[PDB]
Write an enzyme that holds these catalytic residues in place. Sequence first.
Site, PDB file in Angstrom:
ATOM      1  N   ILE A 158       0.848  -1.184   0.000  1.00 31.05           N
ATOM      2  CA  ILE A 158       0.000   0.000   0.000  1.00 31.05           C
ATOM      3  C   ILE A 158       0.892   1.245   0.000  1.00 31.05           C
ATOM      4  O   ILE A 158       0.847   2.051  -0.927  1.00 31.05           O
ATOM      5  CB  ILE A 158      -0.913   0.022   1.264  1.00 31.05           C
ATOM      6  CG1 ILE A 158      -1.899  -1.144   1.325  1.00 31.05           C
ATOM      7  CG2 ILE A 158      -1.618   1.343   1.382  1.00 31.05           C
ATOM      8  CD1 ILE A 158      -2.299  -1.473   2.771  1.00 31.05           C
ATOM      9  N   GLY A 159       1.635   1.416   1.084  1.00 32.45           N
ATOM     10  CA  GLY A 159       2.450   2.597   1.299  1.00 32.45           C
ATOM     11  C   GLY A 159       3.924   2.359   1.512  1.00 32.45           C
ATOM     12  O   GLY A 159       4.358   1.257   1.868  1.00 32.45           O
ATOM     13  N   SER A 172       9.632   3.313   6.671  1.00 28.86           N
ATOM     14  CA  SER A 172       8.453   2.454   6.781  1.00 28.86           C
ATOM     15  C   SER A 172       7.812   1.988   5.439  1.00 28.86           C
ATOM     16  O   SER A 172       8.049   2.578   4.377  1.00 28.86           O
ATOM     17  CB  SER A 172       7.404   3.123   7.657  1.00 28.86           C
ATOM     18  OG  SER A 172       6.926   4.300   7.034  1.00 28.86           O
ATOM     19  N   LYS A 173       6.994   0.904   5.525  1.00 30.05           N
ATOM     20  CA  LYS A 173       6.255   0.249   4.437  1.00 30.05           C
ATOM     21  C   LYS A 173       4.929  -0.315   4.979  1.00 30.05           C
ATOM     22  O   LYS A 173       4.893  -0.883   6.064  1.00 30.05           O
ATOM     23  CB  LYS A 173       7.086  -0.900   3.844  1.00 30.05           C
ATOM     24  CG  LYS A 173       8.179  -0.467   2.882  1.00 30.05           C
ATOM     25  CD  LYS A 173       9.160  -1.595   2.612  1.00 30.05           C
ATOM     26  CE  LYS A 173      10.027  -1.296   1.416  1.00 30.05           C
ATOM     27  N   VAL A 174       3.850  -0.148   4.245  1.00 35.58           N
ATOM     28  CA  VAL A 174       2.552  -0.682   4.666  1.00 35.58           C
ATOM     29  C   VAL A 174       2.147  -1.755   3.631  1.00 35.58           C
ATOM     30  O   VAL A 174       2.237  -1.522   2.420  1.00 35.58           O
ATOM     31  CB  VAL A 174       1.456   0.423   4.909  1.00 35.58           C
ATOM     32  CG1 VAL A 174       0.083  -0.176   5.194  1.00 35.58           C
ATOM     33  CG2 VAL A 174       1.859   1.349   6.045  1.00 35.58           C
ATOM     34  N   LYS A 205       2.115  -2.542   9.075  1.00 35.40           N
ATOM     35  CA  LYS A 205       3.068  -1.444   8.998  1.00 35.40           C
ATOM     36  C   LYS A 205       4.443  -1.980   9.465  1.00 35.40           C
ATOM     37  O   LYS A 205       4.598  -2.536  10.565  1.00 35.40           O
ATOM     38  CB  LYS A 205       2.634  -0.223   9.809  1.00 35.40           C
ATOM     39  CG  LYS A 205       3.508   1.003   9.563  1.00 35.40           C
ATOM     40  CD  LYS A 205       2.883   2.224  10.196  1.00 35.40           C
ATOM     41  CE  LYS A 205       3.773   3.429  10.106  1.00 35.40           C
ATOM     42  NZ  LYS A 205       3.176   4.561  10.849  1.00 35.40           N
ATOM     43  N   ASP A 236      -1.743  18.055  12.336  1.00 34.68           N
ATOM     44  CA  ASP A 236      -1.480  17.951  10.900  1.00 34.68           C
ATOM     45  C   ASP A 236      -2.567  17.225  10.120  1.00 34.68           C
ATOM     46  O   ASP A 236      -2.269  16.503   9.174  1.00 34.68           O
ATOM     47  CB  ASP A 236      -0.124  17.292  10.641  1.00 34.68           C
ATOM     48  CG  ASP A 236       0.348  17.479   9.214  1.00 34.68           C
ATOM     49  OD1 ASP A 236      -0.045  18.481   8.583  1.00 34.68           O
ATOM     50  OD2 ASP A 236       1.110  16.623   8.719  1.00 34.68           O
TER      51      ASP A 236
HETATM   52  C1  LIG Z   1      -7.316   3.498  -6.171  1.00 37.28           C
HETATM   53  N1  LIG Z   1      -7.122   3.448  -4.729  1.00 37.28           N
HETATM   54  C2  LIG Z   1      -7.318   2.087  -4.230  1.00 37.28           C
HETATM   55  C3  LIG Z   1      -7.258   2.056  -2.713  1.00 37.28           C
HETATM   56  N2  LIG Z   1      -6.040   2.726  -2.218  1.00 37.28           N
HETATM   57  C4  LIG Z   1      -5.687   2.579  -0.813  1.00 37.28           C
HETATM   58  C5  LIG Z   1      -4.909   3.636  -0.253  1.00 37.28           C
HETATM   59  C6  LIG Z   1      -4.474   3.585   1.062  1.00 37.28           C
HETATM   60  C7  LIG Z   1      -4.792   2.485   1.882  1.00 37.28           C
HETATM   61  C8  LIG Z   1      -4.224   2.425   3.262  1.00 37.28           C
HETATM   62  O1  LIG Z   1      -3.435   3.336   3.656  1.00 37.28           O
HETATM   63  N3  LIG Z   1      -4.600   1.293   4.064  1.00 37.28           N
HETATM   64  C9  LIG Z   1      -4.178   1.060   5.394  1.00 37.28           C
HETATM   65  C10 LIG Z   1      -3.298   1.814   6.126  1.00 37.28           C
HETATM   66  C11 LIG Z   1      -3.087   1.544   7.542  1.00 37.28           C
HETATM   67  C12 LIG Z   1      -2.107   2.359   8.291  1.00 37.28           C
HETATM   68  C13 LIG Z   1      -1.146   3.149   7.589  1.00 37.28           C
HETATM   69  C14 LIG Z   1      -0.250   3.934   8.347  1.00 37.28           C
HETATM   70  N4  LIG Z   1      -0.270   3.962   9.729  1.00 37.28           N
HETATM   71  C15 LIG Z   1      -1.200   3.185  10.391  1.00 37.28           C
HETATM   72  C16 LIG Z   1      -2.128   2.381   9.709  1.00 37.28           C
HETATM   73  C17 LIG Z   1      -3.774   0.502   8.172  1.00 37.28           C
HETATM   74  N5  LIG Z   1      -4.650  -0.297   7.433  1.00 37.28           N
HETATM   75  C18 LIG Z   1      -4.906  -0.064   6.050  1.00 37.28           C
HETATM   76  O2  LIG Z   1      -5.778  -0.759   5.482  1.00 37.28           O
HETATM   77  C19 LIG Z   1      -5.570   1.416   1.393  1.00 37.28           C
HETATM   78  C20 LIG Z   1      -6.021   1.447   0.045  1.00 37.28           C
HETATM   79  C21 LIG Z   1      -5.630   3.993  -2.861  1.00 37.28           C
HETATM   80  C22 LIG Z   1      -5.786   3.913  -4.369  1.00 37.28           C
END
Ligand SMILES: CN1CCN(c2ccc(C(=O)Nc3cc(-c4ccncc4)c[nH]c3=O)cc2)CC1
Length: 255
Positions: free
Chosen positions: A17-18, A23-25, A39, A133
Amino acid sequence: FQSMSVKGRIYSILKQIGSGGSSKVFQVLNEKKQIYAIKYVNLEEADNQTLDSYRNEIAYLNKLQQHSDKIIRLYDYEITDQYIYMVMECGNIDLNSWLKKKKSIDPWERKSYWKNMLEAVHTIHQHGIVHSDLKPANFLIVDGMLKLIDFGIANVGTVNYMPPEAIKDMSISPKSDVWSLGCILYYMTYGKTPFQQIINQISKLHAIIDPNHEIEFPDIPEKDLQDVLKCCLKRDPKQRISIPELLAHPYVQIQ
Ligand SMILES: CN1CCN(c2ccc(C(=O)Nc3cc(-c4ccncc4)c[nH]c3=O)cc2)CC1
């Protein structure tokens, strides 16, 4: 397309995801093919102040679980001197991606999302946290419900949601979060942020501080929503509406 182990439990990586600094999600799956988000924080080069920011957030996120279901769920974590693994709940999309994609925005949905945000922010405030923020990026949609994923504790950037008192602080209260929440709702209402018109960042900052810079509030069939926005976007934090006051507002209470 690898796997990771967290407190003796194997999770196969579905997708990433990130990606932050250290960090990496990931969207992961357990042995019973259930989805979670992991995370991962690489600590190899994090300083004492950085580790303490990460430890504080985990402690607050872990305590605040019990106080609201508008705060991202944290099932488990592994913390060593080398890494952090946080097993959390998975959401379908973040509010920023959702707002950028959504052409129209339903008043019933907007109101429900406002309520969700007020409850999450209110919970962190009751525990002495001011996020400082806030932006749509800090909210994830999990089964039609918005959840706060970040507390501002752990450390592209948008100056579009910055409170006027935060800019002035060069020579921050719960009211700062009211200004940022108001910008999210202004975006959900008028399709844009209050100072998004100002293409240049240097002048964008001057505008937020300038009392004679009138913020436009075009007339809406929802007059209660119009007052919420006018109350949140008051440059004086002393004259700005508070979260306990926003929860008693007719926009949130009268359907
Ligand atoms: C076209 N779209 C499709 C969907 N998409 C996303 C974008 C972001 C996330 C997400 O950050 N998800 C998560 C992030 C976290 C998280 C991240 C950072 N710190 C704590 C929790 C916890 N659980 C999650 O499910 C999930 C899906 C964007 C593009």
